[PDB]
Design an enzyme around this catalytic site. Structure first.
Site, short mmCIF file in Angstrom:
data_model
loop_
_atom_site.label_atom_id
_atom_site.label_comp_id
_atom_site.label_asym_id
_atom_site.label_seq_id
_atom_site.Cartn_x
_atom_site.Cartn_y
_atom_site.Cartn_z
N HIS A 77 -86.48 -46.03 83.79
CA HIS A 77 -85.26 -46.42 84.46
C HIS A 77 -84.09 -45.53 84.03
CE1 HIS A 77 -81.71 -48.87 85.32
NE2 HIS A 77 -82.35 -48.97 86.49
N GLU A 80 -84.13 -42.13 85.78
CA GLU A 80 -83.62 -42.22 87.14
C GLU A 80 -82.10 -42.02 87.16
OE1 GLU A 80 -84.38 -46.05 89.09
OE2 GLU A 80 -82.89 -45.42 90.60
N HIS A 81 -81.36 -42.58 86.20
CA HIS A 81 -79.93 -42.33 86.06
C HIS A 81 -79.62 -40.86 85.78
CE1 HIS A 81 -78.15 -46.52 85.78
NE2 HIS A 81 -79.47 -46.73 85.84
N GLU A 113 -74.41 -42.74 79.92
CA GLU A 113 -75.21 -43.67 80.73
C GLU A 113 -75.62 -44.90 79.92
OE1 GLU A 113 -75.86 -43.59 84.36
OE2 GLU A 113 -74.28 -42.30 83.56
N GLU A 169 -75.47 -53.04 83.13
CA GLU A 169 -76.43 -53.49 84.14
C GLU A 169 -77.21 -54.70 83.65
OE1 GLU A 169 -78.53 -49.75 84.90
OE2 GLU A 169 -78.41 -50.27 87.03
#
Lengths: 85, 438
Positions: free
Chosen positions: B49, B52-53, B122, B129
């Site tokens: 995940h 992906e960022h 990030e 999130e």
């Protein structure tokens, strides 16, 4: 003071997550030996005095009363019986 | 009759798969990868995940700003998503902007900077999130459902990963993850819409030729999950709507019961009080639920993985004193898949599915997703004729046999969220998985 399912009368619950597993997935007697010995010993030890003290006192009182009564109704206890009545 | 899906390979083992449509003017091209969060261990859970960022945070050539500009200049957009077993990176563009988009995708996948500065930036975004998925109730329910059904197994982990890992993910472990997993034999370049296959294969030879091959090339969609009957209760009396999911272990992509499970799922079907037609649906559960106002909605699902699956239902309800009725009637309809279903329900559900499986594919992104999913889970695109034949082979005997071994008297995974005081304990729910009258 009690409602029914869906409105039992609990204060609002929030923030608690509960988890459990199926009875078919669990060993029902897991830890049974440890429980039977150590858990029962702990539980018994912590309650022992509340049973021992009254039982031992009333058993002592009874034993003294029953022994005196027996002695009063022997030949030796004739005189003490005469006074007691 | 839709155009044929063309398929080619490169030398490294990269598959190229395309379906042209000369009636549209846009094209979706992208890379479907047979890798996801399942490939992480407990220490690097969240890496997939995280990557992906960072894939959109700048490459060896283009910086983050240049990357933004390049895509804006193309005119279309880029999109990506990571699941438990699949990662996708695609680009929707105009017909003649396809070579640009393939070039950008190849760059972000192969030559991403993963600079410490960007990792650190990030790390806060992803931390935030964690505290905002809390609102997406359906996702919360399904993440807890996997966590409990596959307790302490790779399928039981979330995609985001734990807070602890987010703070400790390094560029080293990111690089290691994508070097081990994003190999050519695990990747499919997919084009749908206004794409020429021969053009796409040339672009693949130009951009994806220097991809590593894995040491031991297994076929696409190659995986042992041990389902746990269990429950998670997330009671929240302040929420007005209860969200409940109930599932049993279902079927993998290549199970022989794959279509039988889909037919069984269609017999129960979906319901939504907001849709006008839902009060008139043929499904027995739908009729019980709408007549008695037991729920706002329900959705049957049959989710598949490479070696397992979850089959069940997701319910939402404001009727907090009749949650017991809702669950009771739902499981009594499941019982009938074992005891009572005949040719009546089965033929109806097959009719509905024969169309449904084709209907779903109504734009270039949907088609690309279909090609990519099928190539990464089955190793081939199954033609509509083969699908029509597999559905036709499902009989009422097959449904009853499947339900009797998969549903009847089986352990469930159960998640409830919201005002669920009316949801009974595990035993009373699980006791509804059989009928004493049968």
């Amino acid at each position: 003071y009690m409602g029914w399912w869906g409105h039992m009368g609990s204060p609002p619950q929030k923030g608690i997550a509960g988890y459990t597993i199926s009875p078919f997935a669990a060993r029902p007697f897991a830890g049974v030996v440890h429980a039977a010995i150590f858990n029962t010993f702990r539980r018994t030890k912590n309650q022992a005095l509340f049973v021992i003290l009254p039982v031992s006192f009333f058993y002592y009182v009874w034993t003294q009363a029953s022994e005196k009564n027996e002695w009063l109704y022997t030949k030796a206890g004739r005189h003490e019986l005469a006074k007691a009545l | 009759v839709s155009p044929k899906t063309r398929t080619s390979n490169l030398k490294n083992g990269l598959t190229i798969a395309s379906e042209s449509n000369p009636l549209v003017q846009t094209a979706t091209v992208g890379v479907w990868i047979d890798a996801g969060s399942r490939n992480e261990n407990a220490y690097n859970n969240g890496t997939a995940h995280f990557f992906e960022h960072l894939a959109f945070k700048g490459t060896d050539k283009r910086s983050q700003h240049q990357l933004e500009l390049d895509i804006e200049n193309m005119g279309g957009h880029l999109n990506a998503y990571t699941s438990r077993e699949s990662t996708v990176y695609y680009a929707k563009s105009f017909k003649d902007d396809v070579p640009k988009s393939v070039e950008i995708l190849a760059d972000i996948l192969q030559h991403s900077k993963l600079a410490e500065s960007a990792i650190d930036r990030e790390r806060e975004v992803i931390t935030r999130e964690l505290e905002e998925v809390n609102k997406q109730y359906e996702e919360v329910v399904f993440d807890h459902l996997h966590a409990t059904a596959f307790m302490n197994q790779p399928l039981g982990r979330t995609i985001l990963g734990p807070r602890e890992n987010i703070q400790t993910i390094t560029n080293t472990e990111l690089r290691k993850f994508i070097t081990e997993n994003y190999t050519a034999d695990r990747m499919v370049l997919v084009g749908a819409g206004a794409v020429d296959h021969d053009a796409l294969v040339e672009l693949a030879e130009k951009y994806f030729s220097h991809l590593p091959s894995s040491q031991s090339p297994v076929p696409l969609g190659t995986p042992i999950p041990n389902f746990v009957g269990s429950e998670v209760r997330l009671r929240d009396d302040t929420m007005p709507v209860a969200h409940i999911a109930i599932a049993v272990e279902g079927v993998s992509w290549t199970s022989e019961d794959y279509y039988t499970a889909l037919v069984a799922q269609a017999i129960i079907g979906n319901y939504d009080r907001a849709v006008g037609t839902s009060r008139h649906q043929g499904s027995r559960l739908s009729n019980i639920v709408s007549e008695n106002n037991l729920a706002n909605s329900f959705q049957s699902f049959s989710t598949s993985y490479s070696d397992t699956g979850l089959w069940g239902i997701y319910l939402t309800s404001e009727n907090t004193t009749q949650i017991d009725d809702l669950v009771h009637f739902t499981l009594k309809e499941w019982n009938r898949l074992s005891t009572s279903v005949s040719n009546l329900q089965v033929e109806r559900a097959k009719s509905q599915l024969k169309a449904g499986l084709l209907l779903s594919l109504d734009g270039t992104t949907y088609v690309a997703e279909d090609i990519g999913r099928q190539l990464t889970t089955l190793g081939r695109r199954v033609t509509p004729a083969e699908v029509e034949a597999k559905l036709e082979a499902v009989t009422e005997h097959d449904v009853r046999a499947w339900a009797q071994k998969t549903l009847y008297d089986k352990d469930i995974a159960l998640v409830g969220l919201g005002p669920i005081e009316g949801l009974y304990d595990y035993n009373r729910i699980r006791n509804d998985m059989s009928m004493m009258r049968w």
